[PDB]
Each structure stands twice: as C-alpha cells, then as structure tokens.
Structure 1
Amino acid sequence: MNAVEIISRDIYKAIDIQTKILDYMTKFFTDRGFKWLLPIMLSPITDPLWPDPIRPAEVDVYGVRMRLTHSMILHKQLAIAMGLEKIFVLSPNIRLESRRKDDGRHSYEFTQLDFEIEGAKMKDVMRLIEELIYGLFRKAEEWTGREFPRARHFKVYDYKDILEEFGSDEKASMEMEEPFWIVNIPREFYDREENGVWKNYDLILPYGYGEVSSGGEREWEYEKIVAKIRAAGLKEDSFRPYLEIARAGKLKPSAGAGIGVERLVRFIVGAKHIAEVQPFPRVPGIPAVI
C-alpha cells in the first residue's frame, strides 16, 4: 500500500468505536481515583521484554544513548515510589519485532492503557480488569447491536495446564468462547515470584483474537531484583537509576497491568487484521510509508 492507498481505506466506524472505548476506559480509571499520567518515549532505562515466552531502538539525546519505550513498567514502579498511589497512562510503545510476528495481532507501534496500584494483589487487579471488560462488553452491545461474551468472571488456567492441554496460548484462544486468564508465567525480573510461583496474569480473548491484557505483582526488594537480572543474563548497568532507587529501598509493593487499546478495538469491531483499525498501519517487518 502506497500513501494514497493507505488514506483511501474506510476506517470511520473503527475510529468511532475507538473513541467510545477510550472514553469508557479513561473514565473507568478516573472514577476510581487513579491519577492520569503522560507517557515518556525516551529513557536510559526501559522494559527488557526478556526473558519471555529483541533489543530496544536507541537514539542519542545530547550525547547520551537513550532507549525508545518498550514499555513504561519501570516508570510505573517509580511513580508508585513517588507516592501517587494509583496511576494510569495511555502509553505508546515501540517494539520492532520481525516479519514472523505479522500475525494480525501485532503492530510495531501501539498504545496500551498501563496502570499500577500501590499495595494491590494479583486477585485485586484481575477482578478490576474483569469489572472493566464486563462493563465494556455490555456497552459494545449497545454500540454495535451485536452479542459479546457474557461472563462476569473468567476461568483461570495455570501456564503449565495451557501448555499441557492446548500446546500454546495460541491454540487455546481459538478453542474458547469466553475470555480466560493464564497465570503463573515465568518471565521478567519485575514480576513478583514467591516460592516458585509467579504472581502474574494474562487475559486472553476468545475466538483466536489472543492476549488483550497482561500484568502482575511486582518485586520491590533490591537483592531479589538484582538476582533475577543477573540470573537472566541481563546487564545491571542497563537498569542503573532504577536499581539505585531499589537499593535505596524506595520501591513499594504494587500490582498492575497493561491493556492493548488497538487489540481491544479490533475485537469489538471484529477486524481480521489489527492494521484495519489503525489510520497509519505499523505492520511488523514492513516499514511504514506514512
């Protein structure tokens, strides 16, 4: 698609739905006393996205190598350390994944509504996301006149049982008709692990649409954080100012999640490919024309 073809697509209904979704979700959080933060796109530190079942793009800023935002996870933990209590942000992310990830669900630029709550536990956040999704689905039925999944609470699968029964979260999505949780997934250092149990969670949409939200409780203790980083083969100086805050003992227990906005729009409009809900497509492996 050249530039003219890109702007010649019909996208009005998807954008109409997107506007209603953003209105609903931002209000959901401000109604519950969340602070609305603005994003950052450049920092000496960012989410490594590893280990996880790709290097961040970099640019020089006044002589210092900065990373483009993979995700604001570390900055959300810092906002909690500043005592903001409950926060969310509409955060753009840049993830330059390969052509292989062009599966209809991935974009190399996207936005997630990313939130964090001081002191929250995994079951708190999951219940909160269930409340958000249930309400959103009921409204979407009014917006679109179509029927959406009806459950107030979603089945919870352990990561292991998903690999056991379906082989992958992929096959799982295709087989289900309700959103479902996958919990206890070994991954990045910031996610809390206790007694071999990872206190984290992914919300998977039915009908093959795949993951829509992901989060967890956080590690906040210096020794434990550095251990997981070293163990993973990550370099500590990639996270220096963060670890300095951790060493100072200023990180606080918290839990949160990110919700992929375009993935949600795609589900509600029922679009075959995520690019169809984006005015300026950002397809993995295909550098954007505009």
Structure 2
Amino acid sequence: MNAVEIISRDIYKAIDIQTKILDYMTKFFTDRGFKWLLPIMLSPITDPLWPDPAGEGIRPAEVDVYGVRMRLTHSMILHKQLAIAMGLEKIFVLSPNIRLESRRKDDGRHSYEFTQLDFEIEGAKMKDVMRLIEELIYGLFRKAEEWTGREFPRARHFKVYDYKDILEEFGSDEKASMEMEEPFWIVNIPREFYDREENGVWKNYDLILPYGYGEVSSGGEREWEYEKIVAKIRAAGLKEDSFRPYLEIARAGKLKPSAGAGIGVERLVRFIVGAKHIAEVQPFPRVPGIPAVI
C-alpha cells in the first residue's frame, strides 16, 4: 500500500469511536484522582521486555543524544515506578511505545508503534488493579452499546486462569482467546524483573479479550527492593549497566511498593469497531516487519 492508498482508506467511524474511548478512559482516571503525566520517548533506561512468554527478546532501538546512547521507549514501566518514588501516588499516561518485532508477530493485534494508557498506584495489590480494570471495561462496554447499537460482553465477572492452567487446557493464550465469549484474566506469568515474585508466585495479570482478539492489558505488583531486582536481572542475563540510574534509586531505598497496568488503546478501538486487523483503525499503519511508507 503506497502513500495515496493509505490515505484513501475510510477510517472515520473508527476514529469517531477512538475519540469516545479516549474521552471515557481519561475521565475514568482523572475522576479517581489520578495525575495525568506526559510521555517520554528517549531515555538511558527502558523496559527490557525480556524474559517474557509474549516476546522475541528484541533490543530497543537506540539514538545518539548529545553524544549519549539513548533507548527509544519499549514501555514507561521504569519511569512509572520513578513517578511513584517522587510521591505522585496515582499516575497515568497516554504513552507511545516502539517495539520492532518481526513479521512473525503480524497477527492482527500487534503494531510496531502503539499507545498504552499506562497507570500506576502506590501501595496497590493485584486484586485492586484487576478490580479497577474490570470496572473500567464494564463501563466502557455499556457505553459502547449506546454508541454502536450492538451488544458487548456483560463484563461483571471475569474468570481467572493461572498461566499454567492456560497452557494445559488450551495450549496458549491465543487459543484460549478464540474459545471464550467473555473477557478473562491470565495470572502468575514469569516475565520481566519489575513484576513482583513471591515464593515462585508472580503477582501479575493479563486481560484477554474474547473471540480471538487477544491480550488488551497487562500489569502487576512491582519489585522495589534492590537485592531482589538485581538478582532477577543477573539471572536473566541482562546487563546491570543497562539500568544504572534506576538501580541507583533502588539502592538508595527510594522505590515504593506499587501496582499498575497498561491498556492498549488501539486494541480496544479494534475490538469495539470489530476490525479484523488493527491496521484498519490506524490512520498510519505500523505493521510488524513492514516499514511504514508514511
């Protein structure tokens, strides 16, 4: 698809819906006393996105900034924790992410650029955040019925599956998605160092959409203790130097217990519009493995 073909697509309704979704979600958080932060795109530190069952172990793209190697934002997870450490209590941000995954990840819900609504809560536990996301989704699905005139999932009860039980019953998260008619949770997933692990139990959670639409939100309680964090980094084969300033703050004892999640905005627009491929809801597609012409 050349440049003219890209801008000749019809996208009005999707953008109409996206506008209503953004209005709804931003107000959801400000109404609850969340502070609205602005994103950062370049930093010496960023989400490693590894280890992770849902990743390929890609390294973030880098750019020289005044002679210093900066990483482009994989996710603002580390900066969220730092905002909690500055005492901002409850924060969210509409955060663009850059994740240069291969053609293999071009499954209809992945995009190499996209936005999470990314939020974090000092002192929160996994059950608090899951309950919060459930309330957000329920409210959204009820509004969406008014906007579209179509029926959406009842959204009051979300079943919880342990990761290992997902592997046992369906084989993978994608296949579970294809089999459900209601959104559901997957919990206890071994991944990045920042998610809290206690006695071999990971205090994290992915919200999965039904009808094969796949993951739409992921989060967890966080590690905040330097010793615990460093061990996990070293064990995964990541370099401590890659996280130097974060680890300094960890060492100073300035990280606080917290929990949060990110919600993929375009993935929600896709679900509500009912689009087969997420590119259909983006004015300027960013398809994995395909460098955008515009």
| TM bracket, shorter-chain basis | over 0.9
Cα deviation for residue 88 of structure 1 reads 0.1
CA distance in 2, matches of 1:155, 1:248: 40
Deviations 1:73-113 (A, max 9, x none): 00000000000000000000000000111111100000000
Deviations 1:211-239 (A, max 9, x none): 00000000000000000000000000000
CA distance in 2, matches of 1:151, 1:260: 18
Partner of 1:30: 30
What SS does the corresponding residue of 1:249 show, helix, strand or coil? Answer: coil
CA distance in 2, matches of 1:258, 1:225: 21
Cα deviation for residue 12 of structure 1 reads 0.1
CA distance in 1, matches of 2:202, 2:89: 23
Q: What fraction of aligned residue pairs are identical, expressed as a percent?
A: 100
Partner of 2:280: 276
1:64 aligns with 2:76: no
Pairing of 1:114-193 with structure 2 (within 5 A): 114-193=118-197
CA distance in 2, matches of 1:151, 1:236: 42
Cα deviation for residue 137 of structure 1 reads 0.1
Where does structure 1 differ by over 6 angstroms across 4 or more consecutive aligned residues? Answer: none
**TM-score (norm. length: structure 1):** 1.00
Judge conservation of contact 2:216–2:267 (CA < 8 Å) in 1.
yes
Partner of 2:116: 112
CA distance in 1, matches of 2:281, 2:79: 28
What SS does the corresponding residue of 1:76 show, helix, strand or coil? Answer: helix
CA distance in 2, matches of 1:90, 1:48: 20
Cα deviation for residue 153 of structure 1 reads 2.3
**TM-score (norm. length: structure 2):** 0.98
Cα deviation for residue 161 of structure 1 reads 0.2
Deviations 1:8-39 (A, max 9, x none): 00000000000000000000000000000000
1:47 aligns with 2:47: yes
What SS does the corresponding residue of 1:33 show, helix, strand or coil? Answer: coil
Deviations 1:36-62 (A, max 9, x none): 000000000000000000010000000
Cα deviation for residue 151 of structure 1 reads 2.8
Deviations 1:222-262 (A, max 9, x none): 00000000000000000000000000000000000000000
Cα deviation for residue 277 of structure 1 reads 0.1
RMSD over equivalenced CA pairs, Å: 0.3
What SS does the corresponding residue of 2:107 show, helix, strand or coil? Answer: coil
1:92 maps to which of 93, 96, 99? 96
Judge conservation of contact 2:121–2:260 (CA < 8 Å) in 1.
yes
CA distance in 1, matches of 2:188, 2:122: 21
CA distance in 1, matches of 2:218, 2:70: 25
What SS does the corresponding residue of 1:211 show, helix, strand or coil? Answer: strand
Deviations 1:170-191 (A, max 9, x none): 1000000000000000000000
What SS does the corresponding residue of 1:110 show, helix, strand or coil? Answer: strand
1:224 aligns with 2:228: yes
CA distance in 2, matches of 1:223, 1:40: 27
What SS does the corresponding residue of 1:204 show, helix, strand or coil? Answer: strand
What SS does the corresponding residue of 2:192 show, helix, strand or coil? Answer: coil
